[PDB]
Amino acid sequence: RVFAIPPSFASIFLTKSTKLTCLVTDLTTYDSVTISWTRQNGEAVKTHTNISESHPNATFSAVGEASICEDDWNSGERFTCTVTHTDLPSPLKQTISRPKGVALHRPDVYLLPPAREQLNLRESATITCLVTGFSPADVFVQWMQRGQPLSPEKYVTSAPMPEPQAPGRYFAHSILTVSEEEWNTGETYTCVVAHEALPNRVTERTVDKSTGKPTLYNVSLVMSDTAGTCY
Amino acid sequence: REQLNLRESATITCLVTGFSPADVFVQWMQRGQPLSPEKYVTSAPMPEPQAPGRYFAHSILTVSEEEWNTGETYTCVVAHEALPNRVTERTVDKSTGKPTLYNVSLVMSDT
Amino acid sequence: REQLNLRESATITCLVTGFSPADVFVQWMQRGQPLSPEKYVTSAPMPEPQAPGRYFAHSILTVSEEEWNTGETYTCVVAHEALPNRVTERTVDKSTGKPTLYNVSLVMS
Amino acid sequence: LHRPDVYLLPPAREQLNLRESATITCLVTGFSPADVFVQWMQRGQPLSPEKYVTSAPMPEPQAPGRYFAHSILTVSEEEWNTGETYTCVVAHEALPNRVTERTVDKSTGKPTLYNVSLVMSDTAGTCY
Amino acid sequence: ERIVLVDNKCKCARITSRIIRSSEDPNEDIVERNIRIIVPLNNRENISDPTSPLRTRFVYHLSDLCETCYTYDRNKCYTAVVPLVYGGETKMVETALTPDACY
Amino acid sequence: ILPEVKVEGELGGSVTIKCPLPEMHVRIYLCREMAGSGTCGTVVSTTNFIKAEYKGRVTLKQYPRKNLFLVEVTQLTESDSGVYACGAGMNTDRGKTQKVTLNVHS
Numbered sequence: 196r197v198f199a200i201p202p203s204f205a206s207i208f209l210t211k212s213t214k215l216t217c218l219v220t221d222l223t224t225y226d227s228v229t230i231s232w233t234r235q236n237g238e239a240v241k242t243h244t245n246i247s248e249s250h251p252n253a254t255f256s257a258v259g260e261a262s263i264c265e266d267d268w269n270s271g272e273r274f275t276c277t278v279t280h281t282d283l284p285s286p287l288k289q290t291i292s293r294p295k296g297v298a299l300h301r302p303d304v305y306l307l308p309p310a311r312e313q314l315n316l317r318e319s320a321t322i323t324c325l326v327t328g329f330s331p332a333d334v335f336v337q338w339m340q341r342g343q344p345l346s347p348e349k350y351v352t353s354a355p356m357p358e359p360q361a362p363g364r365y366f367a368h369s370i371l372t373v374s375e376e377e378w379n380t381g382e383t384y385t386c387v388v389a390h391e392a393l394p395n396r397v398t399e400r401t402v403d404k405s406t407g408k409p410t411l412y413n414v415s416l417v418m419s420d421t422a423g424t425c426y
Numbered sequence: 427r428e429q430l431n432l433r434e435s436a437t438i439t440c441l442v443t444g445f446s447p448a449d450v451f452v453q454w455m456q457r458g459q460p461l462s463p464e465k466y467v468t469s470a471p472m473p474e475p476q477a478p479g480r481y482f483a484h485s486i487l488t489v490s491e492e493e494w495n496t497g498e499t500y501t502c503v504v505a506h507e508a509l510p511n512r513v514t515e516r517t518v519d520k521s522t523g524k525p526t527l528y529n530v531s532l533v534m535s536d537t
Numbered sequence: 538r539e540q541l542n543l544r545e546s547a548t549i550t551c552l553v554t555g556f557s558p559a560d561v562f563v564q565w566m567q568r569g570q571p572l573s574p575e576k577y578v579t580s581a582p583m584p585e586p587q588a589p590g591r592y593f594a595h596s597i598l599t600v601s602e603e604e605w606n607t608g609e610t611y612t613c614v615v616a617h618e619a620l621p622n623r624v625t626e627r628t629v630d631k632s633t634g635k636p637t638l639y640n641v642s643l644v645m646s
Numbered sequence: 647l648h649r650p651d652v653y654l655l656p657p658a659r660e661q662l663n664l665r666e667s668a669t670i671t672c673l674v675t676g677f678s679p680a681d682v683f684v685q686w687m688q689r690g691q692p693l694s695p696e697k698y699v700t701s702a703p704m705p706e707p708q709a710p711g712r713y714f715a716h717s718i719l720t721v722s723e724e725e726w727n728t729g730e731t732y733t734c735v736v737a738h739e740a741l742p743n744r745v746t747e748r749t750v751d752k753s754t755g756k757p758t759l760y761n762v763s764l765v766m767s768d769t770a771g772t773c774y
Numbered sequence: 775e776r777i778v779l780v781d782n783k784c785k786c787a788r789i790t791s792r793i794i795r796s797s798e799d800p801n802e803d804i805v806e807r808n809i810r811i812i813v814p815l816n817n818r819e820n821i822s823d824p825t826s827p828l829r830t831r832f833v834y835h836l837s838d839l840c841e842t843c844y845t846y847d848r849n850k851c852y853t854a855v856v857p858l859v860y861g862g863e864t865k866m867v868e869t870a871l872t873p874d875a876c877y
Numbered sequence: 878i879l880p881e882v883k884v885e886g887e888l889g890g891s892v893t894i895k896c897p898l899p900e901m902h903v904r905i906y907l908c909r910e911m912a913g914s915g916t917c918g919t920v921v922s923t924t925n926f927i928k929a930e931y932k933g934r935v936t937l938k939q940y941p942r943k944n945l946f947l948v949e950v951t952q953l954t955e956s957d958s959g960v961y962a963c964g965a966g967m968n969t970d971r972g973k974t975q976k977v978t979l980n981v982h983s
């Protein structure tokens with residue numbers, strides 16, 4: 196099996212060290228294997244050293260990376276990835292073409308607090324973050340608590356899925372789980388997202404106990420010198 | 427609440443969590459009449475990080491903002507092979523997150 | 538209300554009306570755990586007076602007022618043979634229909 | 647040496663009950679050394695000198711170096727249905743802009759019907 | 775007819791005035807003064823920092839209107855900075871707190 | 878306040894509506910606000926939307942050069958009458974910029 200993962204916009208926009216990776220797995224172990232990259236016009240590009248170590252279960256696990264201009268990717272030039280093995284004399288050729296960009300649109304971000312019935316159990320609370328209506332796909336979402344980022348393993352993110360009501364539109368979910376005590380200590384959580392359409396490329400929404408469907412509206416309206424001198 | 431300011435559509439989400447094993451079934455209906463299956467989408471059972479082998483799923487439904495405001499209730503039903511009746515329902519409507527009470531305190535003065 | 542100003546017990550009733558034919562099944566469960574059939578009673582299908590060719594039943598559940606003031610959703614499941622999937626349920630809690638309350642405190646001066 | 651403070655006053659409430667005329671007073675105080683004169687313009691057009699009557703600089707009741715002056719003007723009662731605002735002005739050397747146009751109108755003054763209408767919503771996060 | 779004395783957008787106060795004609799006479803022409811404040815309710819204390827507690831007290835010194843702020847403006851952009859740990863690389867990025875108004 | 882332009886139809890068959898086009902805003906709607914509650918219900922808007930009833934008889938053409946946008950509605954019926962509005966922003970109410978009236982003499 197030969198797997199190719201194209202670079203993500205969340206990697207490009209954040210590191211500026213973009214690269215594309217082809218990896219091989221489920222293959223008998225055999226040294227002296229060559230990894231190459233080919234464009235549509237046949238030009239070859241430099242492949243990087245530091246190939247990944249083989250997996251402990253007696254199968255391949257390799258990394259191959261190369262740098263191509265972001266403007267070249269935006270030009271929609273088809274690129275091909277090839278690997279050579281003696282088992283299969285015919286090298287495996289796979290395409291990592293970037294299809295430019297379809298009509299761009301901004302992702303509406305709605306963040307919702309835990310349900311009232313769930314808090315009745317006084318066990319744990321789950322906060323969701325519903326991104327909606329962004330074209331194209333590959334949105335990047337992360338969570339931090341009171342200015343401190345959380346582990347990637349404390350939340351789960353979905354994958355873009357079609358939108359029945361809107362043709363050519365996608366949406367995604369994300370949920371974070373924490374104890375009830377943490378939710379009941381005014382701790383604040385936020386759901387930052389990253390997308391090409393976003394004018395600042397990054398936007399965020401935030402909720403806490405007091406803002407998520409509260410049971411009290413405590414207000415202290417106070418005005419003075421109503422007469423005053425107005426001109 | 428923000429989604430409502432656009433006066434276009436609304437999205438009710440049904441969240442099923444904690445079950446084991448997989449293969450749960452979710453359907454949407456109002457006032458006892460089943461709803462068309464081309465208006466909602468359901469996710470496949472996804473592993474739960476902390477849980478050893480429990481899973482979760484989520485489904486969403488889109489309705490007109492007017493319909494939400496009209497006062498119609500929408501019930502969500504899940505069918506799993508572990509529930510004693512193998513069926514369960516929940517219910518939400520406009521009267522769910524209304525502020526229970528106000529505590530305003532005007533202190534108008536001229537000095 | 539006057540039942541609760543006793544601090545001994547409260548009764549919750551589950552009126553079922555307008556079904557046909559008989560042999561409806563009602564049971565009471567708390568937060569997913571079915572309760573013992575001795576804790577509640579149930580009536581028998583008796584005809585609806587103004588509505589011909591119909592029946593209705595009843596069921597009450599006794600419960601301490603100590604725990605009713607804390608939660609305990611207390612859903613009432615019904616199993617007839619004409620429902621879309623043969624089972625339905627409803628629930629009520631201490632805050633089922635509490636309305637909005639205003640506490641304006643003008644300090645007009 | 648201090649900024650010449652100035653003020654203006656409208657006609658008296660009981661004065662608007664004989665239906666003959668009305669007087670508007672522009673009070674000029676301070677301006678040490680005493681160097682001021684007032685010209686009463688309306689709509690940018692100076693009025694006749696025979697209308698406004700400035701008198702003299704006079705020392706303040708307690709006068710280390712300060713002074714003050716008073717200048718009034720006579721109008722017609724029936725003309726106040728439109729106001730015209732009858733602007734006043736002062737001039738002094740101890741002023742960065744050497745002009746402090748001061749004007750009032752029937753609308754300006756003490757209000758007699760307060761109508762506060764405050765509203766409370768949760769969609770007022772942004773002021774449209 | 776009504777003139778505008780205050781149009782503050784930070785406090786959404788619109789102080790105006792009008793004089794109503796009496797019953798066919800130039801006397802007792804009562805003057806008016808209309809004030810309309812719209813409290814936000816869902817905004818924070820530090821409007822440009824989404825971590826400060828909610829805004830409970832609202833003080834309105836009408837004299838100043840005719841600096842802590844209360845609401846946002848339909849004609850401006852609010853931004854901030856947040857840490858991102860993509861690839862174990864803590865990095866500060868400008869985030870459009872109020873998007874759709876930064877275009 | 879903003880203008881109260883009024884248009885009529887002179888028997889059904891076609892109708893044309895014009896409203897000013899604001900700058901630095903991406904959303905444009907023509908909600909009818911013909912509800913007892915008053916809450917305006919967006920009829921035809923950008924950002925992708927349309928009215929369950931109004932379909933195939935409603936289209937929008939924005940012209941930045943003239944600072945105007947154009948909406949063309951084919952035919953005419955009894956339902957699509959009354960008044961209409963225009964605006965921008967992300968709040969159908971509190972974001973209006975005109976109050977137009979639609980009538981037909983048929």
Ligand SMILES: *[C@@H]1O[C@H](CO)[C@@H](O[C@@H]2O[C@H](CO)[C@@H](O)[C@H](O)[C@H]2NC(C)=O)[C@H](O)[C@H]1NC(C)=O
Pocket residue numbers: 820822823
């Ligand atoms: C409200 O938040 C702002 C933004 O964090 C605070 O001002 C910032 O202070 C930091 C240093 O603490 C500077 O790096 C920023 O440049 C400041 N912002 C601006 C716009 O200059 C401000 O002090 C906070 N107010 C209160 C009362 O805490």
Ligand SMILES: *[C@@H]1O[C@H](CO)[C@@H](O)[C@H](O)[C@H]1NC(C)=O
Pocket residue numbers: 413414415830
């Ligand atoms: C409600 O407001 C009062 C002051 O008006 C304050 O003492 C109290 O702490 C507030 N409630 C909460 C929960 O903060």
Ligand SMILES: *[C@@H]1O[C@H](CO)[C@@H](O)[C@H](O)[C@H]1NC(C)=O
Pocket residue numbers: 411413529531642
């Ligand atoms: C309700 O308002 C009063 C008066 O301001 C205050 O003393 C009290 O603390 C408030 N209660 C809460 C829960 O905020």
Ligand SMILES: *[C@@H]1O[C@H](CO)[C@@H](O)[C@H](O)[C@H]1NC(C)=O
Pocket residue numbers: 529640642
């Ligand atoms: C109701 O108002 C009174 C008088 O201000 C106050 O003492 C009381 O705490 C308020 N109750 C709540 C729940 O805010």
Ligand SMILES: *[C@@H]1O[C@H](CO)[C@@H](O)[C@H](O)[C@H]1NC(C)=O
Pocket residue numbers: 761763806808
């Ligand atoms: C007072 O204000 C309200 C709200 O704007 C208005 O409807 C009413 O006509 C006003 N009354 C007067 C006398 O102006």
